[PDB]
Swiss-Prot record:
Encoding gene per record: AKR1B1
Enzyme class: oxidoreductase
Species assigned in the record: Homo sapiens (Human)
Keywords: Acetylation, Cytoplasm, Lipid metabolism, NADP, Oxidoreductase, Phosphoprotein
Keyword presence, Cytoplasm: yes
Outcome of mutating Y49F: Complete loss of glyceraldehyde oxidoreductase activity
EC number: 1.1.1.21, 1.1.1.300, 1.1.1.372, 1.1.1.54
Protein name: Aldo-keto reductase family 1 member B1
Amino acid sequence: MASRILLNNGAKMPILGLGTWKSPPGQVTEAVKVAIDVGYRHIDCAHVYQNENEVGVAIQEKLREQVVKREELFIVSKLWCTYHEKGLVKGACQKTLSDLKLDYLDLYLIHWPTGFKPGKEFFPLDESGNVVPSDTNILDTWAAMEELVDEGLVKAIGISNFNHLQVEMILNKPGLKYKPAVNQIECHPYLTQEKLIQYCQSKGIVVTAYSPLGSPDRPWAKPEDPSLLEDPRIKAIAAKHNKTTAQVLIRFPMQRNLVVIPKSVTPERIAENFKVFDFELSSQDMTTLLSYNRNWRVCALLSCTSHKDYPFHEEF
Ligand SMILES: NC(=O)C1=CN([C@@H]2O[C@H](COP(=O)(O)OP(=O)(O)OC[C@H]3O[C@@H](n4cnc5c(N)ncnc54)[C@H](OP(=O)(O)O)[C@@H]3O)[C@@H](O)[C@H]2O)C=CC1
Ligand SMILES: O=C(O)COc1cc(F)ccc1C(=S)NCc1ccc(Br)cc1F
């Protein structure tokens, strides 16, 4: 398959990237170095993951080593919820740039559509455990993102975890200057997201699938939850193709015209997960994988569910 997708800002985005949530700071530098050595050209990062400095050490080493040129890398980060304030967005972006050792990002996303009270805590709580919101809405935060493009800090802007109506809000913004380039959402065979994906694709937004393996290392996993990697129906499709279950799970979103960002810190798996450009799932395989949808989410959070902009009340 073609390895990059054209964005609505005119840049090309690699369809396979390396995820970094939960990658320990003492392991992620090596993970990113190995990833770049074996061909990855897209890294998915975020301030809230608390490891951007260590990601940046890897990136800088590979640039210094002339393993890859900066123009060939596609580096993504995300604005955390406590920085949805007009006067805080630029500084948040600049902190991420400083940590990653970069002078621009290829793509900067609004991490979640919910703003939280600014401060040191990533999840400021009231005395009863509810997150404390910000009064600032997704449209004013979007205008702040647009300024980053115009100041040269980021090449593209986008959104993450926005539902159908929140995407529409952005597209219908009075005076919209730049459309979102990407909506990054959870997507895998048990949460197939057909409705949201068709909406975004019909509007020219590229969708990035996160947690494509079902995030088995999520901190709130329960021993009894469904497991994609262990699903014998998926194992059977993999065996037919002489591939691993992970490779099928990565190829699946690629054939839906999605970008996909599997996470690993294991060098052998980092390599395995990149070897997904030499086989094709049939249409029947694709439809079969889609049939496994159960509307099951890795990423949700009870403490945030009353926030007026919490995204997963809406059907899609
Ligand atoms: N925008 C948002 O709100 C969110 C963005 N994301 C992004 O998406 C990325 C991917 O999602 P994530 O939730 O991390 O989970 P993934 O679905 O990518 O699963 C990661 C887990 O799968 C394991 N794994 C990786 N490759 C294989 C393999 N070949 N065989 C077996 N196990 C494997 C990893 O183990 P190990 O590392 O030990 O090898 C790790 O435990 C995140 O890291 C982050 O960058 C994720 C959630 C939310
Ligand atoms: O968020 C990620 O990328 C991966 O997950 C996380 C990654 C982190 F580094 C810290 C917390 C999260 C959580 S708990 N995320 C879920 C979540 C956060 C905020 C809101 Br609004 C709803 C929600 F569901």
